């Protein structure tokens, strides 16, 4: 039973605590520590706070070298978020969060507990296939690494980016983000019982003193204005699977779409109130939007669509899946547990408290219309991943 | 569920008979229908039935136009040291798709290819063993139809049907013999294994109604046995690499079966050209079954290290493994969906067969199934490596 393991990871070791560490800085950011930089969401955050702030940002990444510099110079290029006068801001720090340390020496380790002020944790290993010991890894050790430095020589305030994949599917009333974490057992797949694992972690640091928010995202989609967007994104992988086939499900689940710029600004934002210390936040969009009406967004840019209840779409699938290699990469995906009429359950929940921290501020997210999906849309076909519609 | 759907399929149009059709030729073979020639077996198939008739091959291939098919089929071969181009006019190169109605020919070229060909060899199929049996359907299924309309069409032509062990039953008491007859759909266990079920249901209803077919149940079919030639997007060369790659490998209960292609190859040709063969079932599987850990033995002998760990153990490991490599994940990702019962201690079931009615057919042919042990494991290794697929021992 892999509940029986993912509790004994979610006990925090003794050590990892406030002890003789020296107080957190009171001042102003002089150095931040980021994973996660040549991903997705970690690409806009990068670029967030080298905006909102005047701190250098130390990035951890997976490479051979001045190799990491290239890698998240790339990333955000591909995002259109580059800028050469993000250079100097950006300290490329060689490592992997799935090792003892981060990947660095003991000595490296040491330096980097002295030099850091505050930590975004963004990084993790995001996938729907692998078991849980794949992940273990990345992200339940990961994590205990990131906590280890927080606790380090110095305090250093930590910001977690954990997702509401942490709560239980299949569930009517929204999840308030002050309700406690349920069982392990509750949960489906081994990238959720790993950021379940994480974020059982992280409170435990929480509770011992160490300064901490956690942010959950919702299903984070593309900028609201340039549409940059991952197309190795699953939502990506499904939007060209119903166009190139013609035909999309019938769900009943409400669907969630958050575009990125509002989770990274919402990011910052929160992690810049120190009424935030402590607290739990739902990035989710407060406005969802039903099966058919996406559906509708998209004829209108001009993709037609025949509509199919979940079950006989899934079919559709099965066997064009014998056709295309990408249809059928994206068929494993959907072949696991949630396959019935009424299509895949998912979570549904409650942003009030974030809506309430964040009123004070100019971070609103923006509404799912048949324009953002253009905008969606025109990228995705400008960028070659989908044919323009005739 | 699935069952319901396979056994609609596993029904034979009533159209699908004999009727009006000339009777089968009874002199020489003038033609040969092969599918399946740009396949891992079918390459060796089209190599032996060129070597022991004078018989046109017609491979039917996917392809834009027939000297791309050509070229397919060509370089498949040669890929397997099976190529001579004095073999270029023996083939007939039929650009069609066996999950296409009418193979994907026109009523006209349907029509055409019912009158010229004498036998059929059906050999190709969709091997792939993520999908589910909607996704094989088309290859699998309404393929294995098509041909025995085919067969059916204009006159008789005798259907020598490659099947596999895997259309049986896993852990039965007894290593299931030749003989006995299809159990149900429910106890199948995949995509693949539940519509090749579904396709020999079909090819024995067509045998019932009369229908000169040969049923020849394939095991686990490995590289040739001299030459070591075995394509690489194999499972088991899949998973022996993984092992390799990581140093370690699971000691599992069952009996491996490992059959040479060669010896499967010339053992369908041989009891093709059978008469004594028409409504029989065989099985061309390794007579000598042999232990995980043997295998093993004849691997580090070679020169490769390996740790031995408990089928679970090696799963974690390989689950653990899996987080930076993406041939290891595409691995885990086989094993991840196997049934419970199979991704135990033991490790994975695997079916038992009796191949006595194979060896009396194959009295003296020159014909019997190589042995496995270090030598075989060794010719085996050193084309992998050789091909670039395996870093050398060492
Ligand atoms: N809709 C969404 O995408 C949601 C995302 N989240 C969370 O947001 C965070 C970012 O997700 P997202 O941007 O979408 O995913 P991405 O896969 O695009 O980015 C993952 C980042 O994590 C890095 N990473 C993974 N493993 C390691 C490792 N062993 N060592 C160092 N770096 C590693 C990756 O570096 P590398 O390039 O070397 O792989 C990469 O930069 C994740 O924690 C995710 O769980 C939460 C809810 C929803
Ligand atoms: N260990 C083994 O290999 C065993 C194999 N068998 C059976 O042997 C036969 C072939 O096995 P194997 O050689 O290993 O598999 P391969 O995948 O190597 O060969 C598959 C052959 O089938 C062709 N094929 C698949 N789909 C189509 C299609 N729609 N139209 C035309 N051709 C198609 C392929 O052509 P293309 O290249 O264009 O895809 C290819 O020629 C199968 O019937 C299999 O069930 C049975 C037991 C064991």
Same mark, same amino acid.
């Given at each position: 039973?892999?509940?029986?393991?993912?509790? =004994?990871?979610?006990?925090?070791?003794?050590?990892? *605590?406030?002890?003789?560490? !020296?107080?957190?800085?009171?001042?102003?950011?002089?150095?931040?520590?980021?994973?996660?930089?040549?991903?997705?969401?970690?690409?806009?955050?990068?670029?967030?706070?080298?905006?909102?702030?005047? =701190?250098?940002?130390?990035?951890?990444?997976?490479?051979?070298?001045?190799?990491?510099?290239?890698?998240?110079?790339?990333?955000?290029?591909?995002?259109? %978020?580059?800028? $050469?006068?993000?250079?100097?801001?950006?300290?490329?720090?060689?490592?992997?969060?799935?090792?003892?340390?981060?990947?660095?020496? $003991?000595? $490296?380790?040491?330096?980097?507990?002295? /030099?850091?002020?505050?930590?975004?944790?963004?990084? *993790?290993?995001?996938?729907?296939?692998?078991?849980?010991?794949?992940?273990?890894?990345?992200?339940?050790?990961?994590?205990?690494?990131?906590?280890? %430095?927080?606790?380090?020589?110095?305090?250093?305030?930590?910001?977690?980016?954990?997702? @509401?994949?942490?709560?239980?599917? #299949?569930?009517?009333?929204?999840?308030?983000?002050?309700?406690?974490?349920?069982?392990?057992? &509750? %949960? @489906? #797949?081994?990238?959720?019982?790993?950021?379940?694992?994480?974020?059982?972690?992280?409170?435990?640091?929480?509770?011992?003193?160490?300064?901490?928010?956690?942010?959950?995202?919702?299903?984070?989609? #593309?900028?609201?204005?340039?549409?940059?967007?991952?197309?190795?994104?699953?939502?990506?992988?499904?939007?060209?699977?119903?166009?190139?086939?013609?035909?999309?499900?019938?769900?009943?689940?409400?669907?969630?779409?958050?575009?990125?710029?509002?989770?990274?600004?919402?990011? @910052?934002?929160?992690?810049?109130?120190? /009424? &935030?210390?402590?607290?739990?936040?739902?990035? +989710?969009?407060?406005?969802?939007?039903?099966?058919?009406?996406?559906?509708?967004?998209?004829?209108?840019?001009?993709? #037609?669509?025949?509509?199919?209840?979940?079950?006989?779409?899934?079919? /559709?699938?099965?066997?064009?899946?014998?056709?295309?290699?990408?249809?059928?990469?994206?068929?494993?995906?959907?072949?696991? +547990?949630?396959?019935?009429?009424?299509?895949?359950?998912?979570?549904?929940?409650?942003?009030?408290?974030?809506?309430?921290?964040?009123?004070?501020?100019?971070?609103?997210?923006?509404?799912?219309?048949? &324009?953002?999906?253009?905008?969606?849309?025109? &990228?995705? @076909?400008?960028?070659?991943? !989908?044919?323009?519609? /005739?």
């Amino acid at each position: 039973d892999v509940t029986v393991e993912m509790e =004994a990871d979610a006990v925090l070791d003794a050590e990892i *605590a406030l002890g003789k560490a !020296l107080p957190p800085v009171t001042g102003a950011l002089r150095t931040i520590l980021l994973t996660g930089a040549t991903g997705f969401l970690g690409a806009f955050l990068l670029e967030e706070l080298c905006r909102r702030t005047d =701190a250098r940002i130390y990035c951890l990444v997976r490479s051979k070298t001045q190799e990491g510099m290239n890698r998240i110079r790339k990333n955000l290029e591909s995002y259109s %978020l580059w800028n $050469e006068a993000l250079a100097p801001r950006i300290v490329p720090v060689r490592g992997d969060i799935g090792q003892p340390l981060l990947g660095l020496s $003991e000595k $490296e380790f040491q330096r980097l507990s002295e /030099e850091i002020d505050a930590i975004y944790h963004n990084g *993790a290993l995001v996938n729907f296939l692998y078991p849980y010991e794949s992940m273990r890894a990345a992200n339940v050790l990961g994590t205990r690494e990131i906590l280890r %430095l927080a606790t380090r020589t110095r305090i250093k305030p930590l910001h977690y980016v954990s997702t @509401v994949s942490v709560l239980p599917l #299949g569930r009517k009333a929204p999840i308030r983000e002050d309700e406690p974490l349920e069982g392990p057992s &509750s %949960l @489906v #797949g081994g990238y959720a019982q790993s950021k379940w694992v994480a974020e059982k972690l992280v409170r435990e640091a929480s509770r011992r003193g160490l300064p901490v928010t956690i942010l959950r995202p919702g299903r984070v989609t #593309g900028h609201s204005r340039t549409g940059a967007w991952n197309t190795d994104d699953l939502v990506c992988r499904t939007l060209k699977g119903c166009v190139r086939m013609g035909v999309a499900p019938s769900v009943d689940a409400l669907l969630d779409l958050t575009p990125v710029d509002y989770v990274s600004s919402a990011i @910052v934002d929160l992690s810049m109130r120190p /009424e &935030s210390i402590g607290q739990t936040y739902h990035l +989710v969009n407060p406005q969802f939007v039903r099966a058919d009406e996406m559906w509708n967004y998209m004829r209108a840019f001009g993709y #037609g669509l025949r509509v199919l209840p979940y079950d006989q779409w899934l079919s /559709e699938l099965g066997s064009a899946a014998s056709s295309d290699s990408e249809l059928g990469d994206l068929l494993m995906f959907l072949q696991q +547990v949630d396959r019935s009429v009424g299509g895949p359950r998912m979570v549904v929940c409650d942003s009030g408290d974030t809506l309430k921290a964040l009123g004070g501020t100019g971070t609103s997210c923006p509404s799912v219309d048949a &324009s953002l999906i253009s905008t969606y849309l025109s &990228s995705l @076909v400008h960028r070659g991943f !989908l044919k323009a519609p /005739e």
